[PDB]
Scaffold this active site. Structure first.
Site, PDB file in Angstrom:
ATOM      1  N   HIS A  50      41.069  49.143  38.770  1.00 65.88           N
ATOM      2  CA  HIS A  50      40.382  50.385  39.118  1.00 65.88           C
ATOM      3  C   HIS A  50      38.900  50.148  39.346  1.00 65.88           C
ATOM      4  O   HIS A  50      38.216  51.048  39.800  1.00 65.88           O
ATOM      5  CB  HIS A  50      40.594  51.502  38.101  1.00 65.88           C
ATOM      6  CG  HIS A  50      39.956  51.330  36.758  1.00 65.88           C
ATOM      7  ND1 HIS A  50      40.658  50.866  35.656  1.00 65.88           N
ATOM      8  CD2 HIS A  50      38.714  51.600  36.321  1.00 65.88           C
ATOM      9  CE1 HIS A  50      39.880  50.874  34.591  1.00 65.88           C
ATOM     10  NE2 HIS A  50      38.676  51.294  34.977  1.00 65.88           N
ATOM     11  N   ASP A  65      46.834  47.378  35.821  1.00 66.96           N
ATOM     12  CA  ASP A  65      45.408  47.568  36.015  1.00 66.96           C
ATOM     13  C   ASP A  65      44.670  46.266  35.717  1.00 66.96           C
ATOM     14  O   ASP A  65      44.020  46.117  34.673  1.00 66.96           O
ATOM     15  CB  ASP A  65      44.862  48.687  35.139  1.00 66.96           C
ATOM     16  CG  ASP A  65      43.467  49.130  35.538  1.00 66.96           C
ATOM     17  OD1 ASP A  65      42.959  48.637  36.593  1.00 66.96           O
ATOM     18  OD2 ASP A  65      42.914  49.961  34.806  1.00 66.96           O
ATOM     19  N   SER A 105      35.424  49.796  31.187  1.00 66.41           N
ATOM     20  CA  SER A 105      36.476  49.367  32.096  1.00 66.41           C
ATOM     21  C   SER A 105      36.352  47.912  32.462  1.00 66.41           C
ATOM     22  O   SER A 105      35.264  47.495  32.881  1.00 66.41           O
ATOM     23  CB  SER A 105      36.376  50.123  33.391  1.00 66.41           C
ATOM     24  OG  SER A 105      36.736  51.455  33.209  1.00 66.41           O
TER      25      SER A 105
END
Ligand SMILES: COc1ccc(-n2cc(C(=O)O)c(=O)n(Cc3cccc(C(F)(F)F)c3C)c2=O)cc1
Ligand SMILES: *[C@@H]1O[C@H](CO)[C@@H](O[C@@H]2O[C@H](CO)[C@@H](O)[C@H](O)[C@H]2NC(C)=O)[C@H](O)[C@H]1NC(C)=O
Ligand SMILES: *[C@@H]1O[C@H](CO)[C@@H](O)[C@H](O)[C@H]1NC(C)=O
Ligand SMILES: [Zn+2]
Ligand SMILES: [Zn+2]
Length: 215
Positions: free
Chosen positions: A45, A89, A171
């Site tokens: 992402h 991811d 992230s």
């Protein structure tokens, strides 16, 4: 990182700061980690039109001799990555050149640790300095409320009774357990109530070797 502490500068020398460019918005930021001198591992992402990696950072607003700002030539997002479920991811970034090895830059129920430059609160700005927090690895049922969580693909991270957690901007950074990378920060709740969902690196290790060996 919510509820963590500032790291000793350069104590986490694999840590990568990612500035991601998109054609239709301003820059966004993620973490990541150097697994080979020319490869950084992060979350899918965090993909964009272009990425710059900064190695050797502590205070990301204060340029210093430890910094190595490196061009990413190619992004290798997991081919089954799903933008709804966030399954798979995980992404590899190939750097234009091999990084220099320095003191500040090198490759990389139980308690694990996660580091990043993300927000220190839901309404707080990103951290100028690298922060680290220790989080508990939860039984998968603690993450059931994330309807697309899958125990085989993902770790469930962080005691719901504590406020400690990775959050926006964290992230793509590594979760380390006993000094080994086991997870990648992936997603959680907008209110930062733990637990959060991390990619389970072990599941992806065949895919990681495949990419490395072909590039
Ligand atoms: C696939 O299903 C999902 C469900 C949730 C989202 N989602 C949504 C948010 C929102 O709606 O604002 C949001 O802020 N975040 C950020 C966030 C929150 C809590 C913890 C973390 C982490 F621990 F991962 F760092 C992170 C990154 C978010 O991941 C993304 C997809
Ligand atoms: C990170 O480095 C920046 C320098 O760019 C520091 O920012 C200064 O912080 C003080 C407050 O402590 C401000 O009064 C100055 O105006 C800031 N200078 C600049 C150039 O912005 C920041 O404090 C550092 N953060 C740390 C070490 O926690
Ligand atoms: C992503 O997951 C959703 C929900 O399971 C599925 O319907 C969709 O087709 C997937 N997208 C792709 C192409 O991976
Ligand atoms: Zn630390
Ligand atoms: Zn320094």
């Amino acid at each position: 990182i919510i509820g963590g502490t500032e790291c000793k500068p350069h104590s986490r020398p694999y840590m990568a700061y990612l500035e991601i460019v998109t054609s239709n918005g301003p820059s966004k930021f993620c973490g990541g980690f150097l697994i080979r001198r020319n490869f950084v591992l992060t979350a899918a992402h965090c993909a964009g039109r272009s990425i710059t990696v900064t190695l050797g950072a502590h205070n990301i607003t204060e340029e210093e001799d430890t910094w190595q700002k490196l061009e990413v030539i190619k992004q290798f997002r997991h081919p089954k990555y799903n933008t709804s479920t966030l399954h798979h991811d995980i992404m590899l970034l190939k750097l234009k050149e091999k990084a220099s090895l320095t003191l500040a830059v090198g490759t990389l129920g139980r308690m694990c640790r996660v580091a990043g430059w993300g927000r220190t609160g839901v309404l707080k700005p990103g951290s100028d300095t690298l922060q680290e927090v220790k989080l508990r690895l939860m039984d998968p049922q603690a993450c059931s409320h994330f309807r697309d969580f899958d125990h085989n693909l993902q770790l469930c991270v962080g005691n719901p009774r504590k406020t400690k957690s990775a959050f926006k901007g964290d992230s793509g950074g590594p979760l380390l357990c006993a000094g080994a990378a086991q997870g990648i920060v992936s997603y959680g709740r907008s209110d930062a109530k733990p637990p959060a969902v991390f990619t389970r690196i072990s599941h992806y290790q065949p895919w990681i070797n495949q990419i490395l060996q072909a590039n």
